[PDB]
Every structure is written in structure tokens, then in C-alpha cells.
Amino acid sequence: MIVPVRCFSCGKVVGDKWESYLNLLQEDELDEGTALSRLGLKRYCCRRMILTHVDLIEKFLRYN
Amino acid sequence: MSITETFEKPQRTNTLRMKHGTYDKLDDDGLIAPGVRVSGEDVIIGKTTSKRDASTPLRSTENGIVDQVLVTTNQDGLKFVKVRVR
Amino acid sequence: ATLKYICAECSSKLSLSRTDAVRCKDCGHRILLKARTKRLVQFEAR
Amino acid sequence: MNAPDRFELFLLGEGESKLKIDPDTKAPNAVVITFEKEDHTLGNLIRAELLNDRKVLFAAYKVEHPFFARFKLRIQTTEGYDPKDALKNACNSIINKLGALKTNFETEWNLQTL
Amino acid sequence: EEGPQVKIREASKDNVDFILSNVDLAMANSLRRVMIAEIPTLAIDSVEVETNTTVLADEFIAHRLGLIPLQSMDIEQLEYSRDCFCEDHCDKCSVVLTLQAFGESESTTNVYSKDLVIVSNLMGRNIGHPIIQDKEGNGVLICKLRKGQELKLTCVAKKGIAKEHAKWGPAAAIEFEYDPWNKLKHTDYWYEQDSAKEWPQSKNCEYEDPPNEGDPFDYKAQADTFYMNVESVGSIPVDQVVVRGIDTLQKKVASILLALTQM
Ligand SMILES: [Zn+2]
Ligand SMILES: [Zn+2]
Ligand SMILES: [Zn+2]
Numbered sequence: 001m002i003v004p005v006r007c008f009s010c011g012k013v014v015g016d017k018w019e020s021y022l023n024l025l026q027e028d029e030l031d032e033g034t035a036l037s038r039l040g041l042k043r044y045c046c047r048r049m050i051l052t053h054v055d056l057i058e059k060f061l062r063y064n
Numbered sequence: 065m066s067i068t069e070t071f072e073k074p075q076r077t078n079t080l081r082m083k084h085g086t087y088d089k090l091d092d093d094g095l096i097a098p099g100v101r102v103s104g105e106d107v108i109i110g111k112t113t114s115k116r117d118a119s120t121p122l123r124s125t126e127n128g129i130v131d132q133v134l135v136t137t138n139q140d141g142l143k144f145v146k147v148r149v150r
Numbered sequence: 151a152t153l154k155y156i157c158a159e160c161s162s163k164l165s166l167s168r169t170d171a172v173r174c175k176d177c178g179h180r181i182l183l184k185a186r187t188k189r190l191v192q193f194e195a196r
Numbered sequence: 197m198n199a200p201d202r203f204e205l206f207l208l209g210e211g212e213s214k215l216k217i218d219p220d221t222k223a224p225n226a227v228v229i230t231f232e233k234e235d236h237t238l239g240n241l242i243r244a245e246l247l248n249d250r251k252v253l254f255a256a257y258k259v260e261h262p263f264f265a266r267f268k269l270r271i272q273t274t275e276g277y278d279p280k281d282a283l284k285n286a287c288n289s290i291i292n293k294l295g296a297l298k299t300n301f302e303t304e305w306n307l308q309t310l
Numbered sequence: 311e312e313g314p315q316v317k318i319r320e321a322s323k324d325n326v327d328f329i330l331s332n333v334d335l336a337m338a339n340s341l342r343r344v345m346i347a348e349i350p351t352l353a354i355d356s357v358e359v360e361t362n363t364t365v366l367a368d369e370f371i372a373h374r375l376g377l378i379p380l381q382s383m384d385i386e387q388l389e390y391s392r393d394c395f396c397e398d399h400c401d402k403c404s405v406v407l408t409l410q411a412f413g414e415s416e417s418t419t420n421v422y423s424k425d426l427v428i429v430s431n432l433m434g435r436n437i438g439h440p441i442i443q444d445k446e447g448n449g450v451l452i453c454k455l456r457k458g459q460e461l462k463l464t465c466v467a468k469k470g471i472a473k474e475h476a477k478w479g480p481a482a483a484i485e486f487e488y489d490p491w492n493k494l495k496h497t498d499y500w501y502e503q504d505s506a507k508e509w510p511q512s513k514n515c516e517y518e519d520p521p522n523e524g525d526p527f528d529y530k531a532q533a534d535t536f537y538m539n540v541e542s543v544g545s546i547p548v549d550q551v552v553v554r555g556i557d558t559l560q561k562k563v564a565s566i567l568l569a570l571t572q573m
Contacts, residue, residue: 001366005377005450006543010483011476013379013543015450016443019420043483060365061418061456064161070168093167099187129191131367133184134158137172150367186361193357193369195376195465196475202474203392206348214569231566237343238562244336284570287563293337294563296313297330298556304316305549310323 001056009045017041021050069118071095071145073110081117083107094119095145096130103127108147122149156183205265206233217280226254226272227279235259239267245286251277326548327485327539329517335488335533342486342538345555348471351478351545352382352405352437355470360462364453371453375465376477378423378450380405382545384435388469399466405438406430409463413455421461423449429464438467441544480546485539490514493521494531 003018017039024035036047071094073087085105089096094110102108102122108130111118122128131150138144154165160177163185173180208214212232220226231239239257246255254272259265271279315331330338357372364371391403399406408427413419423440424447432438442449453461472479489496490512499505514537542548 001370002374002453003451005374007482010541011479011543012482012541013443013450015374015377016448018451019448020444057365057454061454063365095184097184097187099191100189101191129369135155135172135182135184136180143172190358190360191368193359193372195353195355195357195372195477205473206471214565215573217573234562237340237347237559238566240336241340241559241563242566244334248334280570284567287567290337290563291560291567293313293333294341294556294560296311297316297333298553298560300311300314300316301549301552301556303311304318304328305321305326308318308321310321 001060003053003055004049007043007046007049010043012041012046014041014046014049017050018053018055067113070112071110071143072112074112074115074117074119077114079115081115083117083119083121085121087119095133095135096147098130098132100130101127102130102149108149109145153185156185157181158183200263204233205235208233220270220272223254223272225275225277225279226270228268228270229283230266230268233265234267235265236267239269241290242283242286243269245289246271246282248289249282249285252282321548323547324544325539325541326552328537330536330538332534333536335536338488338536338538339486341552341555341559342484344558345481345484345540345551346479347473348558349480349546349551349554350382350385350469350471351480352380352385352388352467353470353477353545354378354380354407354465355468355477356466358464360464361460362463363459364455364461365459366453371461371463374452375409375463376475378426378452379441379543379545380407380467381437381439381441382480383547383550384437385469385546387433387435388437391468399468401431401433403468404430405432405467407438407465407467409452409461409465411453411455411461413457413459416457419455419457420448420451421453421455422451425452426465443544480542480551482541482543484541485537487512487514487537488533488535490518490537491521493528494533495527496533 003015005015006012007014020039021035024030024038025032032051036050041047041050073090073092073094074082085107087107087110089100089102089106090110091097096102096108105121105124107119107121109120128149130147132148134146136144152165153163157164157174157177157179158181159179162176164175164182172182214232216230218228220228236259239259243255243257246252251274252271253274254270257267257269259267271282273279273282314333317329317331318326319329320327354375357375359368362368362371389403391399394403396403406429408429409425411419411421411425424442426440428438440449470478499509501508540548540551542551
């Protein structure tokens, strides 16, 4: 619904990386993988975390 | 013919058709209120016919947390209640 | 000073019951929401 | 539910001990110790040291079911050498070599930048 | 200083790569397991919700709170709540934190873990503080509000071990390898045409002499050297994942001596 706080598998915090990831795509124009590696998410477990999140709360917030 | 039902916390008034569970969680309208934990075979909706009991409990294998209680009328005018638990 | 009910739609603490109707005060909408206990609810964060 | 609290993996029930020591009937100078609220961490470690001891004839451990944190270690020793002594001798090595290592480490870590 | 030898190769606030040298596999794996499972740490473990008009549910939120890593350098000087003589919690067994948020702006208001206020007396033990590692110092995103929406909570943190729930774990991944060439034949390599063409060389091979094709297998060799790398989430600095790791074992073993004595 939100970025999960950690990688389910290794525990690395990853919930402090969502705004940055999305800034790193739209503002500085990197491809999704270069971006993830810049935030230091280098095992495929953590990468899967950000790369496959879906921010559904951004839809939930349109209701009144 | 006014042989009516009424949402209301019932108690033990000369017919007493009540349930193996607690009514201790309902409010004076006969309805838990969001936030409360529920459980066991807890009553969730209080109802009556003096006292022919028409009152709903939580499914036996379930437990959760009341999340919304919603009250309205039908086309035909009946008060409905809907309780969702989480 | 209190809460009891809420209006599903126009968002506004109603509070009423029996011979009262089941509608509203400043939208006329027939749907009402029960409103959160004040008994405080605790979670284990697990 | 039916789920035993997680605290049960590290913390003793009412009336349980850390060790129960029982004589083994199968062979001489043999014992079986059951360690509660422990698992492989300790069990593979004690065990492996007991084997660096040449008065150690046998040693082995197992967790019989994964749902309970308890292991069972079986030590056999040479005649005149109590098995419980072989387990002080072995717990004592361990604690020594780790001693050692937290020092070699604490050290290597000031020799350090970033 | 004879015994198990150390050899850091990299270090950073966040990781420490090293080589243990002169130890058994068992002790090396055991210290791995301890670092993952049994170093004490501090974590939200009770949450009371005064208000939440948020688009998330409470336990969803609560769960997320227990996962925000919270400073834990001084955690020996917090007693376990179950060991303390208080009724419930207090300042000897607990930090209490607060969270209030209201979507004041039109645009969407985020709630981060810096918005966490400690409300209890620390006795100047460095614990409790939300850890923050991003450039903007926001730490973790907990929630999001819309204009009109509110969230008010309290939390109690408590000392805990990852055995009990992983939120209390200080370590993240722990790299761990040995015998990069395969000289010990501890593993047998699957392949289609050639085992060496088809498997990638570990980084740890440079460090260690390739074997020579003649060399008839060495039956006596043992696994004596381990390429580790511990990574910390931040509630405890790193070097300290290791040292309290080594220290936690050493105490487990001693509780065994102590309990022989009591027989
Ligand atoms: Zn991961
Ligand atoms: Zn209205
Ligand atoms: Zn206390």
C-alpha cells in the first residue's frame, strides 16, 4: 500500500528510499536499475522491494 | 402488528432468550463501536422482541476489531445495521 | 463536549436515535457512521 | 490460536532447567545432557570443541523436533574422565577463544578509517 | 594475540568486511547466527491509538512502527521489561514515543520517523532516537495524509531479540564464504560442459592460492578461513554488531558453566 519499511528477506531498511527513487527517475532521468543501485540496494532481494512496490496509498488518498 | 424488534442492549426481563456469549461490549443502541476488540462469540449486535432475543454474535472461530458500524434505512423503511469487523 | 454518530457523506457529527428519524443537519443523507470508542486500544506491533 | 509465544524459544517455563543430565545406558562413561531453550548455535559449538579433546570418545547433538528449542548432546569419554568435566573443559575453551577474538577485533577496528 | 585472528578489509559506518582466520567453522557460523538472532536491541513493541483517520489501519501502522529502527548503543543499561520490578513499563525498561500528525497542507503530508517524539526520561543513555540515514534526514516513511486527516499515537519501546521478532534484529545480511577455490571439495559443482567456465569466480579467490592440477587432493585440510561482511541497519553501529555478537555467545556459554555449578 506504502513502501514497506524493510526487505522482507534481509531486514535492510528500504522505507526511507522511496521518495529518493522516484526523484532519481523523474528528476535525474536514470533507468530503474541504475537508480536502485545508487541507493545502495544491491542485493536482488532489496531491489525487488522497491522495483515492484505499488503505491497504492496515492489512490487511497483521493477519496474524501 | 407492532410484535416489533428493537436494537437495544437487552438484560433479563421475564423471557431472557439470550446468548452463551457477553453483551458487555455493546453501547445503549445495541452496537459495538469502532475500536473495540471482539472475540469469542461476543455479541455485536443487540436485539429483542418481553425479551425474545434477535441478537447476532461474532462467528465462533473469529476475532478482530470492529471497523465500521453503519446504520441506515431500507426503501421500505427498516433500520439496517451493518457492522464490519477487521 | 461528545461525538456519538457521523454522516457518511457531509462529514458531521450528528447524535440522535428513536422517534428522531435516521437522516441529517446540513446535508439530508440517510447513512450514518458509529464513531470511534474513546476506550483506548492497544496493539502489539508485531 | 494454537501458536506457542515466541518468548518460549529463549526463556524457561515454570519448573524447567537449563540442563538435565542423564546416564547413558547404552555404553560406559556416557552421558546425555538436554539443554533447554537453546538450538544449534550452542549445540553445534559445544559439540565441535568436545571433539578437539582426545579423551573424547564420542560426541553428538540433535534437535529432535524443530518446534521445540531444546537439544540433546551425548558425550562419551575415557575411563576416569567425567564427561561433565569434558564439557567444562570445552565450554572453557570456547569462552577463551572468543575472549581472544573480541580483542583481536576491537583492535583491528581502531587501526581503521571510515 | 593467539587464537582466532581478525583482518578487516573494509569498514564503513554501515558494513565491515573481514576475514576470520584460525577458527573452526562452527564458531564462525555460530557467531553469524548470533549476529542475526540474539543481540539485544530496542524497538516499538506497544502502540495505543488515540486517533487515525488515515487511509491505513492501525495494526498496519503499528507493525510499521515496530520496524523503525531506534537507537540502541546504550541498551545494556535498559532492563528487559519482564525482568523489571515495575508494574508494566517505566523508565528503567522503556522509552515512550509520541506521534501526532495532521494534514494541514492542501497537498499530501507525509509522516516520517523523525516526527517521533520521545516523552520519557532517558537518564542520558543514548537510546530511543529514531535512526536517520537519508540526505534529507526524514528517516522512514510511516504514513501519508490527506488534508483533514489525523493520526495520534503513543508507543512504547522495549528491549528485545530477533528470535522473538525480527524487528529487534540489528543485522541485515551477513555475507559468509569459505574455500572459494574448491579445494576442500565441500561442494560438487553442477555443469553442462565445464565446471570452471560455467561458475563465476568469487571475489575472495584473489586472496587465496589457486590449486595446481597435479596436486592430489588434500585429505587433511580443514576450514580455517572465512570471508565475512556484516551489514548494520543502524540501531547499533557495526563494529558493535560483531563485538556484542562475540559477547552474546560468550555469555550463553557461561550460563552453561553457571548451571553445572548449580548442579
Ligand atoms: Zn534484502
Ligand atoms: Zn450530512
Ligand atoms: Zn519497568
